[PDB]
Amino acid sequence: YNLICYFTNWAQYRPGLGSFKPDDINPCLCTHLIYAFAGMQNNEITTIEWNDVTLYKAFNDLKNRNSKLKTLLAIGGWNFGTAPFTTMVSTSQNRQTFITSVIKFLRQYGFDGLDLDWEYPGSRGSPPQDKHLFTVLVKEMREAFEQEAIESNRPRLMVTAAVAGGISNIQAGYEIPELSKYLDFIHVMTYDLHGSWEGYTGENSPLYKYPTETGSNAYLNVDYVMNYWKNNGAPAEKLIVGFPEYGHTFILRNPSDNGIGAPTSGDGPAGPYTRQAGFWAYYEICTFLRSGATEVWDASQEVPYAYKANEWLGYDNIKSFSVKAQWLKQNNFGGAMIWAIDLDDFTGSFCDQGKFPLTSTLNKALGIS
Amino acid sequence: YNLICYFTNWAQYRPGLGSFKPDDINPCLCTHLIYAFAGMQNNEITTIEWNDVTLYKAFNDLKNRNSKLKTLLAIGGWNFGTAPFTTMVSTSQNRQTFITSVIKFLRQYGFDGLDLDWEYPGSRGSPPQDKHLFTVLVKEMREAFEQEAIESNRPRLMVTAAVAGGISNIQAGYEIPELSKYLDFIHVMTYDLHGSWEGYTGENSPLYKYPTETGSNAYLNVDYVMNYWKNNGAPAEKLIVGFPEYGHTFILRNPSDNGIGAPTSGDGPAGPYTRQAGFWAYYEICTFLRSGATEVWDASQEVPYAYKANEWLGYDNIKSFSVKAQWLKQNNFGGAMIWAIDLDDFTGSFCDQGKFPLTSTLNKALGIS
Numbered sequence: 001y002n003l004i005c006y007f008t009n010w011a012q013y014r015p016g017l018g019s020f021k022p023d024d025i026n027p028c029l030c031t032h033l034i035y036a037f038a039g040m041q042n043n044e045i046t047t048i049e050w051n052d053v054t055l056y057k058a059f060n061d062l063k064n065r066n067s068k069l070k071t072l073l074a075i076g077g078w079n080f081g082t083a084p085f086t087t088m089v090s091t092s093q094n095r096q097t098f099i100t101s102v103i104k105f106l107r108q109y110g111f112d113g114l115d116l117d118w119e120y121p122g123s124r125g126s127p128p129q130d131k132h133l134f135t136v137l138v139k140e141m142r143e144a145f146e147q148e149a150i151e152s153n154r155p156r157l158m159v160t161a162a163v164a165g166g167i168s169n170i171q172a173g174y175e176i177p178e179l180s181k182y183l184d185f186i187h188v189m190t191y192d193l194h195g196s197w198e199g200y201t202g203e204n205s206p207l208y209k210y211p212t213e214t215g216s217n218a219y220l221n222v223d224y225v226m227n228y229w230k231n232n233g234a235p236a237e238k239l240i241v242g243f244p245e246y247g248h249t250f251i252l253r254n255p256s257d258n259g260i261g262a263p264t265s266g267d268g269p270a271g272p273y274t275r276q277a278g279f280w281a282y283y284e285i286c287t288f289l290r291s292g293a294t295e296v297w298d299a300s301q302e303v304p305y306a307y308k309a310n311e312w313l314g315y316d317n318i319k320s321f322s323v324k325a326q327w328l329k330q331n332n333f334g335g336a337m338i339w340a341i342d343l344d345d346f347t348g349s350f351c352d353q354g355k356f357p358l359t360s361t362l363n364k365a366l367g368i369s
Numbered sequence: 370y371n372l373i374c375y376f377t378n379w380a381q382y383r384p385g386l387g388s389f390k391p392d393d394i395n396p397c398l399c400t401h402l403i404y405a406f407a408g409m410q411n412n413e414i415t416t417i418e419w420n421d422v423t424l425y426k427a428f429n430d431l432k433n434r435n436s437k438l439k440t441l442l443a444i445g446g447w448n449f450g451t452a453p454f455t456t457m458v459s460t461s462q463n464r465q466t467f468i469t470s471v472i473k474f475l476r477q478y479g480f481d482g483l484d485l486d487w488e489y490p491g492s493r494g495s496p497p498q499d500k501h502l503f504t505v506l507v508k509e510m511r512e513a514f515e516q517e518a519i520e521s522n523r524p525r526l527m528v529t530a531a532v533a534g535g536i537s538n539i540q541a542g543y544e545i546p547e548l549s550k551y552l553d554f555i556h557v558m559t560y561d562l563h564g565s566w567e568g569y570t571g572e573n574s575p576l577y578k579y580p581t582e583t584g585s586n587a588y589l590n591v592d593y594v595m596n597y598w599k600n601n602g603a604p605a606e607k608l609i610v611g612f613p614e615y616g617h618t619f620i621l622r623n624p625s626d627n628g629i630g631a632p633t634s635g636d637g638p639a640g641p642y643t644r645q646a647g648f649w650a651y652y653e654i655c656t657f658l659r660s661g662a663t664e665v666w667d668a669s670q671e672v673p674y675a676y677k678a679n680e681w682l683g684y685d686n687i688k689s690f691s692v693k694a695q696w697l698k699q700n701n702f703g704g705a706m707i708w709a710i711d712l713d714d715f716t717g718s719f720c721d722q723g724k725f726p727l728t729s730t731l732n733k734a735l736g737i738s
């Protein structure tokens with residue numbers, strides 16, 4: 001099995017003990033490390049932080065302590081939007097400019113492949129033709145990578161993609177049978193399935209549907225999403241299940257209404273390290289739990305939630321990671337990916353569960369080490 | 370540098386190609402987007418348009434397509450007048466009502482700050498004490514924003530203000546040294562410096578005085594106005610130069626008499642899209658220039674003008690924006706603001722200068738991207 005670990009190049013700016021750089025990564029935890037994110041300028045891949053080249057070096061130097069480790073560079077992300085991708089795929093010339101820039105960039109800085117993280121073709125302003133043009137892009141990139149391996153006498157660069165977990169986005173965005181032939185791995189973002197945007201509490205990455213959920217609300221679970229990809233053309237062995245090392249926060253309208261689906265207001269509280277309304281890193285979650293939050297096991301969905309006064313948290317812990325790892329193995333998927341390793345308790349000093357408690361759980365469950 | 374771009378919530382009603390909504394904004398052009406306008410009822414901030422809530426969401430979603438972007442909500446404007454502001458600042462209780470409503474409103478709908486656009490304290494019916502009480506409002510708002518950020522673990526809400534470019538209004542309205550301490554940015558409205566109200570032609574935003582000017586007419590240029598603010602207490606780094614993406618129209622009394630200072634008999638006709646006598650959007654100007662107008666460069670003032678028969682236009686183009694951008698950079702000002710991005714040739718269909726030609730000129734000149 002593969003264990004794919006995202007690292008984010010803005011975690012370095014978090015205060016105090018939240019600051020995270022590549023040398024904080026244990027090189028033996030994962031099989032693949034993915035660097036989030038590169039950007040795009042004039043249809044060419046580019047850095048986006050002043051010290052990206054330094055961090056690339058430190059990142060790819062982790063292979064000095066694990067000969068099996070592979071690294072990928074991810075381009076895009078949620079906050080990148082769609083417009084630069086739409087422009088880039090709109091003409092064969094723009095696609096070739098981009099693919100050529102990618103080959104040179106990955107080889108120069110030591111990466112083993114590219115992770116396309118366009119969120120998403122055919123949605124968020126991207127027009128409908130981008131569903132097919134994304135397939136064209138991936139096909140042309142796979143072919144270009146095959147040719148460059150011939151031309152350089154090196155093992156081929158990998159092409160992977162992070163793909164939507166929401167069914168409407170999937171249907172608007174991906175020609176799954178053809179796309180699946182050319183991608184090496186498909187990183188399914190089976191998280192952010194519920195959040196304060198819905199106006200009521202729910203779990204970030206529930207394995208199963210809640211018992212009363214019907215229709216499209218029953219799409220919002222890992223089991224449905226992964227099986228949707230599998231049964232619409234993607235080989236299980238290429239499908240990678242998404243694991244969040246964060247949870248979503250909510251403000252309850254009434255603290256006595258604190259179950260799944262309880263009404264909420266506003267965007268949810270922010271933590272002192274991640275400083276973004278609506279989510280907490282796992283190490284921030286540990287500070288909430290240790291302060292006396294009430295912990296509940298959502299037995300039907302195999303995930304925890306917790307609440308304290310009017311604060312409500314839907315999250316993942318060691319137990320839910322263990323259950324979901326067992327599930328993905330028994331369903332013959334290719335492994336797991338984590339968003340993101342810098343959100344785990346990497347120092348071990350917040351959760352009293354050892355260093356990297358969540359990532360180590362998957363390392364153990366998937367037989368990585 | 371900062372590039373601050375106003376969007377207006379009535380541009381949506383323009384016919385055909387003129388209809389502009391937040392999704393027409395290129396999220397990478399500006400550093401800050403300001404939503405014009407909110408209103409006031411019972412000393413609390415409120416919506417004005419039937420669909421403001423939907424437009425707020427689309428507007429603040431632009432921050433999900435550019436991780437550096439900030440958004441602000443502007444209150445007031447020309448048509449708002451002064452009476453609600455005078456009542457709101459008159460007592461500490463009404464100011465607190467307003468400030469509390471603003472914090473709630475901005476956090477609920479996703480804005481990063483408030484832009485005060487009172488036109489103007491101490492003028493247009495506002496009594497003399499509003500000069501000092503405006504300072505008090507800003508100080509109290511800044512203090513409230515600072516405390517909210519601490520309690521919420523989130524970046525602090527900004528407070529900015531659009532301020533007069535006319536000297537008499539400046540003297541009657543602003544305690545410049547104290548106000549400058551508490552505002553994050555000072556958006557100086559270095560436009561509408563001439564218009565048909567004066568009875569002769571003149572430029573909307575000339576950089577320098579015209580060679581014949583010696584009286585109070587010598588105040589009516591960007592150079593003088595910005596240096597007035599700077600030399601009377603405002604730090605250059607907080608001062609933002611106003612750039613208009615529209616021009617003013619005039620009817621000439623004698624069409625053969627068609628230079629600067631030529632006699633006029635009123636506003637020019639409403640444009641087909643903006644539909645308000647006295648000005649044309651830049652995209653409407655490009656159509657005028659293709660309709661048989663003569664274009665002239667006002668060399669002393671670094672701006673164009675144009676005329677056709679009895680219609681005279683004082684305006685800005687790529688060249689004048691470029692000259693004034695070079696100037697503002699040499700003076701170490703904080704950047705530029707644009708009134709308004711919906712008046713640029715956002716479709717690219719009118720001027721043959723690409724999409725957003727005027728805004729793109731400033732983005733390039735200021736190194737925003």
Ligand SMILES: CC(=O)N[C@@H]1[C@@H](O)[C@H](O[C@@H]2O[C@H](CO)[C@@H](O)[C@H](O)[C@H]2NC(C)=O)[C@@H](CO)O[C@H]1O
Pocket residue numbers: 006076077078079080117119162189192246276279339436
């Ligand atoms: C592979 C993947 O999950 N990609 C997306 C990520 O971008 C997103 O994380 C969010 O990334 C933003 C930059 O694009 C950051 O500004 C933001 O803070 C971060 N949010 C969190 C909770 O880490 C993740 C998680 O939502 O999923 C995809 O959307």
Ligand SMILES: CC(=O)N[C@@H]1[C@@H](O)[C@H](O[C@@H]2O[C@H](CO)[C@@H](O)[C@H](O)[C@H]2NC(C)=O)[C@@H](CO)O[C@H]1O
Pocket residue numbers: 077078119163164165166167169189191192193194195197220
């Ligand atoms: C099932 C579904 O479609 N849920 C939507 C969420 O995915 C979406 O959140 C975004 O999800 C991305 C993964 O696809 C993350 O990369 C991204 O960070 C995340 N954005 C936020 C703000 O958390 C939300 C956006 O409002 O909508 C749901 O409908």
Ligand SMILES: CC(=O)N[C@@H]1[C@@H](O)[C@H](O[C@@H]2O[C@H](CO)[C@@H](O)[C@H](O)[C@H]2NC(C)=O)[C@@H](CO)O[C@H]1O
Pocket residue numbers: 375445446447448449486488531558561615645648708709
């Ligand atoms: C920041 C700023 O410029 N604020 C003022 C704007 O209100 C004014 O624009 C005018 O706003 C009116 C509503 O208040 C509209 O009715 C009118 O059409 C609009 N005029 C234009 C040319 O867009 C601008 C420009 O004059 O300057 C300030 O006065």
Ligand SMILES: CC(=O)N[C@@H]1[C@@H](O)[C@H](O[C@@H]2O[C@H](CO)[C@@H](O)[C@H](O)[C@H]2NC(C)=O)[C@@H](CO)O[C@H]1O
Pocket residue numbers: 446447488532533534535536538558560561562563564566589
């Ligand atoms: C130098 C000076 O004081 N000029 C005055 C103009 O500013 C003023 O026009 C108004 O200016 C505002 C910016 O301060 C704009 O928001 C507003 O739209 C604009 N109004 C119109 C009708 O263009 C005019 C008002 O007649 O008087 C000048 O004296």
Ligand SMILES: [Mg+2]
Pocket residue numbers: 256257258259
């Ligand atoms: Mg209850």
Ligand SMILES: [Mg+2]
Pocket residue numbers: 625626627
């Ligand atoms: Mg003549």
